[PDB]
RNA sequence: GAUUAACCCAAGUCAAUAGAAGCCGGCGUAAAGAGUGUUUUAGAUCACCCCCUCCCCAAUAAAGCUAAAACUCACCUGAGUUGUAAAAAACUCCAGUUGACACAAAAUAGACUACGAAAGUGGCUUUAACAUAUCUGAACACACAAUAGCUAAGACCCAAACUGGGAUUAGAUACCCCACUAUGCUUAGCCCUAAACCUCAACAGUUAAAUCAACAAAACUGCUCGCCAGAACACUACGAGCCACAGCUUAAAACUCAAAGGACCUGGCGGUGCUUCAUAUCCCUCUAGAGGAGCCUGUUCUGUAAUCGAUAAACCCCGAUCAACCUCACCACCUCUUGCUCAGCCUAUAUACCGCCAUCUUCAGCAAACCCUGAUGAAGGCUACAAAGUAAGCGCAAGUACCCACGUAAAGACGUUAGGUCAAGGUGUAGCCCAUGAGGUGGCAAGAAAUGGGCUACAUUUUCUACCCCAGAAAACUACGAUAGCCCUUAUGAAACUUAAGGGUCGAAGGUGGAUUUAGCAGUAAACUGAGAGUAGAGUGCUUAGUUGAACAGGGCCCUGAAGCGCGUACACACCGCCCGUCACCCUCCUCAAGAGGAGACAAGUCGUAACAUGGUAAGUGUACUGGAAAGUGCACUUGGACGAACC
């Protein structure tokens, strides 16, 4: 890295700097005073202080990117969100008054809830023992869990099974399905959970 | 190089009583410091640093080891910790060196005035191969002209427009300053980054010092040193090696 | 291991001059160029002819002054003037040195069709930078 | 290390030399290299503690025996006086005893130098 | 401390040897390293509760939320406890002293199985 | 070997043979304390005065008894139990509880060190009982002697050679699992062997020194007995003795060799221990690929009259930043002979080299000169509350280049691989001189097959068009997909079916690729664009500039390595090491009913890998059974293995 180790990652949060001094604790005050003497990396172009910034959606867009084509990936993401919102509006209008309250129309909430539902709880690690390889169930960190959800969503949307269907439409359909706890990705999570439950007897093989 | 004088006379008798230790200067220094500590026992930071081992060797005209330097520095710190007098402080200050604490505070551009009397600040920025020179006026409607073109026409990508929005929005000054920036070189994103850096640097002249510090901490005023890495011979790219066959 | 123009280490008895003691990667960093002409500059020609002239001059001076040269020659080209600055040893009689100076200067002038001067700096012995 | 400072001070006061730090290998048997070809080695070495800090004989005892330097030495009941030229059996741990030894040796050296100066002055006078 | 008189096979010892050590019974000037304890699989009980609830609820997370949260909390506690255990091993509070400091102490006072 | 010279002796020289010259030395590991105890004849002075553990703990034989755990039986519950790295086989008259329950074996005590001559002896009780008022002493006897084994009769819970089955394996006559027998136990006889070793004889005495090869368990003295005298043949043959009959004890010789051996030093290595790490990295991970398709290009193989070299990491768009003629060194034919050169050779040798480099190195050590330790051996040389190291110099580092102090370059020693290049050039040695030299003309440089690296794709995050990011169409046999095939034109050139570019025509394999595998930690990977070197022209290649621009970066010592401390070592060109046994020929010797066996040498090929590292099942002794073979297993014993050496 061209940044010396002295450099620190910048913190982009307006509320963090607009916080009143009186509310600040001694630890926070000391941290703020110390940060005046450190070196700070340049703010990355990906993230800004815009109120419409979503780190989850930015990460999903980066994972969808192919060959550094972030314009196309961002276009696909915004088209997917627009398609989700349009489908939700269509369902809202076509539904009765009772069902209108339950129908969700925020694409961001739908996306976050779909990823949260797609998140696996217990993973499998291949462990060598006695010359064999065993799929030992293991706990998963939240980071790996979110990454697995995102990667499963993207891989399922990129599957060749869907013919001539554009990525925004496929991704919107999968997001709506996952938001309702249905679809191939939720089935993949269930299959992982079932395999872990079956291999539960191998859990003692783990040494960590 | 500084050379130590002959350490014994015609008769052969060495001048210093610690000659046969082989490190008479260092051990004499340690002896004096220990004696000062004993005297102090009998009686009962930011702008300075301890000298490095090389400085101590230059002072003593004797080769030293890292552990010897550690022992000396520990003894000096123990000397400082006590209720030292004026002479005991002068002895310490003999070895203490001065460190220039360069302020990380961003330099504020002077506020210049045009023919019409409007106030403005000019700055420059670089991102990869892109160089941008920006002028930010104290009063404005938020209009930004890039090479005489509106920034929404010049930047048809939402990411670049968000990059432009970042400095003003971070200090809650959207639509309050008019900007005229000329950028040359690099791609669209490098140009947007350079314009962002120049705009933030210029806008520092019209915000409070705390706001300038916040912008610096947010990364709006650091010149991004990340530039393209040269391709090396014998490998496909900057880091990509040729496929290796075993 | 790189071998180019490197005097390898030994038991510490081999004397090396400043020119020899520095590896090629020290050129323009710790040592200069033994020939100075405008041939290799951008937008210039006749570089190959200048290189061939330099090679021939070095070989000719090495052969004409056997065992006298104490270091590499320094060739300078100003206009059509060709200056050869050479560090020689104080062993030959000055009569022979002057004879060789006149001889080489006239021969090179009539060979390369340019005024050639030969400046000799004499040293009692080879200048030693270090012992490798 | 309890008496390094006292012994160094005594050596400085009496005009003689002291070694109370880690005895580097060869300070006596390799002095011509460490110091120089014209270094003058001590003509008498006085050990106020013949044992090193790991309860073995000080290497300087053996090295001074090699270099034919007579060694005066205070030897406790756990020391080895075989190679010490003039061993003095005595306690080497109590501060009182060590101070007594330092006083006696310093006074003897000072009296010797005073007598040498007096004899030289008297012989020049006559 | 067990007696060593008449144990080893030595001249003048009439009886057959009691001890046959493969190394001399002489104290070394160093102690063994701080041996790690082989890690065991953790949070197995909470994992079992979660998996049994999955089997009873057809792997529906909505019904099993409580047990799933318990298992996740146990996993996070186990990871943080492993990190804290590494920190404690660096600290060395649990033992009477770290092996490094003990080795330093033994270096200061070495064993002397020889004469001098 | 000849030749020149030299050396020794000399009327001799010296090839063969024989003789002369050998016991006061040792026995823990080199061969050697005989498995143990006790005599007479004898020997010794350690006998007498004169004496400090007498006695008790697990000596021995006999008789009796039994606490825990088994087996079996009985009731009641369940359909499983056993088995391990994982399984299978096996048993379900099985498993669990409870109760009854032995000719088997004797937790804890034992952190004790006792008894016995040794072998051995560690549950309890009782009886008998543990020689010698100097010492050594029997291999010419007498009496004992672990385990194994034989004989005869019994017991039989459990274990277990053999055997059978299951598994593993290339095979598995083993390791792993299951069942069972001889056997382990009792009684009466035999057998008489052990790494029967504490490899250290009994008795008396010393710690004085001249302590002392090394390691081990310090060095010795007096006396006596036993044993030993290069290795292998050889715990063998013959003879003799024995209750032993495939046996045990004593025990040679011939052929052969210049060694064998014991203990160490250093290094390497270990399917070696502990600890800490790996930061594109060893594993799980993240991204893009390779391996599947077509094409370009290199290589192997085949082919031709037709180069050469690299060819594991460290070869394979490599010498070439480049072969149509030239280049060219290849082949065929023709020609010249002091030849462009005070000749020439791209002839052999890179295992003679210089020159330039690869590689560990994505290391950090190399080393002059001294000094000290090892008893002055090979060797080694550090502890900071410091204990023998000091060290010039090279390297790292620092400085320097690009955009910083970061990063990338560059650098990167001594050495390793007799690593690459004799074809850059030079050059040692050897080789040709009417040719292995020089010139001219023409020509090969292909693909049965296999493979490496790239390029293009297999499309919808796509294809075409405009634009360079607010669009319109296409979207499966006229879709995506050739830079390929065929035809034509142009460029260069003297020469283009051949090289390049363009146009036309065609629209192929292919539908995200098995085992396996490469690279990347940030402006990096990925994708896109441009320029340069060299050419007359020529690469999908190389060098280089820029643009858009990510994901993971957290856990682990399980896998592979590194470092620190050790351990082992029969290896030392150093584990790609060494090494064992069976199955052919020849040679020598020995024992032989001349057929054959044995030993050694010769040393092959074959089948395994038994030993040396925890040698991948620790090794070995005795013994029994079994096996193609080293060998496997049972039982007891040994360390000539280790168990990491405070607690954790
Ligand atoms: K390929
Ligand atoms: Mg290199
Ligand atoms: Mg004392
Ligand atoms: Mg022996
Ligand atoms: Mg015996
Ligand atoms: Mg007797
Ligand atoms: Mg027996
Ligand atoms: Mg039986
Ligand atoms: Mg059984
Ligand atoms: Mg079995
Ligand atoms: Mg019994
Ligand atoms: Mg035994
Ligand atoms: Mg036998
Ligand atoms: Mg026999
Ligand atoms: Mg017989
Ligand atoms: Mg392929
Ligand atoms: Mg070839
Ligand atoms: Mg070849
Ligand atoms: Mg040709
Ligand atoms: Mg030729
Ligand atoms: Mg070579
Ligand atoms: Mg480099
Ligand atoms: Mg460097
Ligand atoms: Mg070779
Ligand atoms: Mg070769
Ligand atoms: Mg020819
Ligand atoms: Mg075409
Ligand atoms: Mg033409
Ligand atoms: Mg083996
Ligand atoms: Mg084995
Ligand atoms: Mg065995
Ligand atoms: Mg068997």
Q: What was the resolution (in A) of this experimentally determined structure?
A: 3.1
> Are 3 or more Cβ–Cβ pairs between A and C shorter than 8 Å?
no
DSSP at B205: G
Q: Does E109 touch chain D (CB under 8 A)?
A: yes
Tell me the two tokens of residue B76: 């000096």
- In the block, which residue shows the tokens 């710790």? C30
Report chain breaks in chain B, C–N > 2.5 Å, as residues after which they occur.
Answer: 44
Q: Does A181 touch chain E (CB under 8 A)?
A: yes
Bridge-based pairing of strands D71-75 and D86-89 is: parallel
- B interface residues, A as partner, C-beta within 8 Å: 104-105, 157-159, 162-163, 165-166, 169-170, 172, 189, 192-193, 197, 213-214, 216-220, 222-227
Q: Does A3 touch chain B (CB under 8 A)?
A: yes
CB nearest to A41's CB, from B104, B169, B219: B219
Partner chains of B (3+ C-beta pairs under 8 Å): A, D
Instruction: For residues A78 and D107, give the distance between their C-alpha atoms in angstroms, rounded to a whole number.
Output: 97
Q: How far is the CA of E21 from the C1' of F611 (A)?
A: 26
Instruction: For residues A58 and A62, give the distance between their C-alpha atoms in angstroms, rounded to a whole number.
Output: 6
CB contact under 8 A, D55 and E112: yes
Q: How far is the CA of C3 from the centre of ligand 21 (A)?
A: 15
Query: In Å, how far are C69, C70, C92, C117 from C97, measured between CA atoms?
Result: 11, 14, 7, 14
Query: In Å, how far are A31, A47, B184, B226, B229 from A4, measured between CA atoms?
Result: 20, 22, 28, 12, 16
CB contact under 8 A, B22 and D27: yes
Residue nearest to nucleotide F313 (CA to C1'): B246
With contact defined as beta carbons under 8 Å apart, do C31 and C44 qualify? no
Hey, is B148 helix, strand or coil? coil
Closest CA to C57 of C122, C120, C116, C102: C116
CB contact under 8 A, D54 and E110: yes
For residue B195, how many other CB atoms are within 10 A of its CB?
29
Alpha carbon of D69: minimum distance to chain E alpha carbons (Å): 21
Dmax over CA atoms of chain E, in Å, equals 82
Identify any residues that bridge with B127 across adjacent strands, giving them in sequence order. B130
Partner chains of D (3+ C-beta pairs under 8 Å): B, E
- In the block, which residue shows the tokens 């990129």? A158
Start-to-end Cα distance in chain D: 49
E-chain residue closest to D81, CA distance: E116
With contact defined as beta carbons under 8 Å apart, do C97 and C120 qualify? yes
Instruction: For residues B47 and B97, give the distance between their C-alpha atoms in angstroms, rounded to a whole number.
Output: 9
CB nearest to E41's CB, from A117, A190, A204: A204
> Strand F positions with any atom < 7 Å from protein CB?
85-86, 111-116, 119-120, 198-200, 216-219, 274-276, 284-289, 312-314, 316, 355-360, 367-373, 381, 383-394, 399-401, 403-416, 452-454, 459-462, 469-470, 475, 511-512, 517-527, 542-559, 564-565, 638-648
Identify any residues that bridge with D72 across adjacent strands, giving them in sequence order. D46, D86
For residue B175, how many other CB atoms are within 10 A of its CB?
10
Hey, is D47 helix, strand or coil? strand
- Torsion of Cα atoms, B29 then B30 then B35 then B39, to 10°: 100
Substitution target from A3, A9, A21, A43 for chain B, most B beta carbons within 10 A: A43
Q: Does D78 touch chain E (CB under 8 A)?
A: no
Q: Which helix (H) or strand (E) holds E99?
A: helix E99-108
Q: Which helix (H) or strand (E) holds E21?
A: none
Instruction: For residues A111 and A80, give the distance between their C-alpha atoms in angstroms, rounded to a whole number.
Output: 10
Query: Where are the alpha helices (H) located in chain B, listed in sequence order?
Result: 24-43, 53-60, 66-81, 86-95, 151-154, 158-170, 188-203, 209-217
Alpha carbon of D47: minimum distance to chain B alpha carbons (Å): 14
With contact defined as beta carbons under 8 Å apart, do B164 and B196 qualify? yes
Instruction: For residues E113 and B160, give the distance between their C-alpha atoms in angstroms, rounded to a whole number.
Output: 78
Identify any residues that bridge with D37 across adjacent strands, giving them in sequence order. none
Neighbours of ion ligand 3 (CB under 5 A): D 76, 92-93
Closest CA to C130 of C13, C29, C32: C13
Alpha carbon of E111: minimum distance to chain D alpha carbons (Å): 9
A17: chain B residues, CB-CB within 8 Å = 214, 217-218
CB contact under 8 A, B104 and A10: no
Q: How many CB pairs under 8 A join B and D?
A: 44
Bridge-based pairing of strands C74-78 and C35-36 is: parallel
Structural biology method used: cryo-EM
Burial string for D9-48 (b: 16+ CB within 10 Å, else e) reads bbbbebebbbbbbebeeebbbebeeebeeebebbeebbbb
Question: Left (φ > 0), alpha (ψ -120 to 50) or beta: where does B137 sit?
Answer: beta
Instruction: For residues C58 and C72, give the distance between their C-alpha atoms in angstroms, rounded to a whole number.
Output: 8
């Amino acid at each position: 890295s061209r940044y010396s180790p002295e450099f620190k990652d910048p913190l982009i949060d307006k509320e963090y700097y607009r916080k009143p001094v009186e509310e600040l604790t001694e630890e926070e005050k000391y941290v703020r005073e110390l940060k005046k003497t450190q070196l700070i990396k340049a703010a990355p172009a990906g993230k800004t202080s815009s109120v419409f910034e979503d780190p989850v959606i930015s990460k999903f867009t980066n994972m969808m990117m192919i060959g550094g084509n972030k314009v196309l990936a961002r276009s696909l993401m915004i088209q997917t969100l627009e398609a989700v919102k349009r489908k939700q509006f269509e369902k809202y209008h076509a539904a009765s008054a009772e069902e209108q309250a339950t129908i969700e129309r925020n694409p961001y909430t739908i996306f976050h809830q779909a990823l949260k539902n797609c998140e696996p709880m217990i993973g499998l690690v291949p462990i060598l023992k006695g010359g064999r390889f065993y799929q030992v169930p293991v706990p998963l960190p939240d980071r790996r869990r979110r990454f697995l959800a995102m990667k499963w969503m993207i891989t399922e949307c990129r599957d060749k099974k869907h013919q001539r269907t554009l990525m925004p439409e496929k991704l919107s359909h999968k997001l709506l399905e996952a938001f309702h706890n249905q679809g191939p990705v939720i089935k993949r999570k269930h299959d992982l959970h079932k395999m872990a439950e079956a291999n539960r007897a191998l859990a003692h093989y783990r040494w960590w | 190089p500084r050379q130590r004088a002959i350490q014994w006379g015609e008769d052969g008798r060495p001048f210093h009583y610690l000659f046969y230790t082989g490190k008479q200067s260092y051990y004499s220094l340690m002896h004096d410091v220990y004696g000062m500590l004993l005297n102090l026992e009998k009686h009962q930071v930011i702008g300075s640093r301890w000298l490095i081992k090389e400085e101590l060797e230059e002072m003593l005209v004797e080769k030293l080891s890292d552990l010897d330097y550690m022992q000396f520095i520990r003894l000096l710190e123990k000397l400082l910790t006590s209720q030292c007098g004026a002479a005991e402080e002068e002895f310490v200050q003999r070895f203490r060196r001065s460190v220039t604490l360069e302020s990380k505070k961003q330099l504020i551009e002077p506020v210049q005035y045009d023919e019409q009397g409007m106030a403005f600040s000019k700055s420059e920025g670089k991102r990869k191969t892109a160089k941008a020179e920006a002028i930010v006026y104290k009063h404005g409607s938020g209009r930004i002209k890039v090479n005489g073109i509106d920034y929404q026409l010049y930047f048809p990508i939402t990411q670049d427009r968000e990059q432009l929005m970042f400095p003003f929005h971070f200090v809650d000054r959207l639509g309050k300053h008019d900007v005229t920036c000329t950028v040359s070189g690099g791609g669209r994103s490098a140009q947007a980054g350079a314009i962002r850096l120049a705009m933030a640097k210029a806008l520092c002249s019209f915000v409070t010092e705390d706001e300038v510090e916040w912008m610096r901490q947010a990364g709006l005023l650091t010149t991004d040193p990340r530039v393209r890495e040269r391709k090396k011979p014998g490998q496909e790219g900057a880091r990509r090696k040729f496929t290796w066959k075993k | 291991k790189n071998r180019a123009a490197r005097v390898r280490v030994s038991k510490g008895d081999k004397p090396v001059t400043y020119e020899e003691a520095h590896a090629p990667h020290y050129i323009a960093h710790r040592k200069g160029w033994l020939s100075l002409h405008t041939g290799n500059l951008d937008g210039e020609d006749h570089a190959a002819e200048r290189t061939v002239e330099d090679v021939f001059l070095r070989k000719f001076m090495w052969g004409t002054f056997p065992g006298c040269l104490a270091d590499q020659l320094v060739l300078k080209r100003r206009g059509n003037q060709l200056e050869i600055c050479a560090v020689v040893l104080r062993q030959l009689s000055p009569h022979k040195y002057y004879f060789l100076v006149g001889y080489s200067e006239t021969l090179l002038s009539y060979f390369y069709k340019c005024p050639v001067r030969l400046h000799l700096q004499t040293v009692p012995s080879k200048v030693v930078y270090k012992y490798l | 290390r309890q008496f390094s400072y006292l012994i160094e001070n005594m050596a400085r006061d009496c005009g003689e030399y002291a070694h109370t730090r880690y005895f580097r290998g060869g300070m006596l048997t390799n002095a011509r290299l460490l110091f120089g070809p014209t270094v003058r080695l001590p003509d008498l070495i006085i050990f106020l503690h013949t044992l090193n800090n790991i309860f073995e004989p000080h290497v300087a005892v053996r090295d001074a025996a090699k270099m034919n330097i007579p060694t005066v030495g205070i030897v406790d009941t756990n020391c080895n006086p075989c190679l010490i030229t003039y061993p003095v059996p005595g306690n080497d741990d109590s501060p009182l005893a060590v101070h007594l030894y330092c006083r006696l040796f310093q006074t003897a050296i000072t009296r010797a130098k005073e007598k040498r100066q007096q004899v030289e002055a008297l012989y020049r006078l006559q | 401390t067990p007696s060593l008189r008449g144990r080893l096979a030595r001249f003048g010892n009439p009886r057959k040897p009691v001890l046959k050590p493969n190394k001399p019974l002489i104290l070394a000037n160093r102690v063994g390293e701080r041996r790690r304890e082989k890690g065991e699989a953790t949070c197995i009980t909470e994992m079992s509760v979660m998996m049994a609830c999955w089997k009873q609820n057809e792997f529906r997370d909505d019904a099993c939320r409580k047990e799933i949260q318990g298992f996740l909390d146990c996993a996070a506690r186990a990871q943080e406890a492993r990190k804290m255990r590494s920190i404690q091993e660096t600290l060395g509070e649990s033992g009477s002293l770290l092996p490094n400091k003990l080795n330093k102490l033994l270096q200061r006072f070495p064993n002397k199985p020889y004469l001098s």
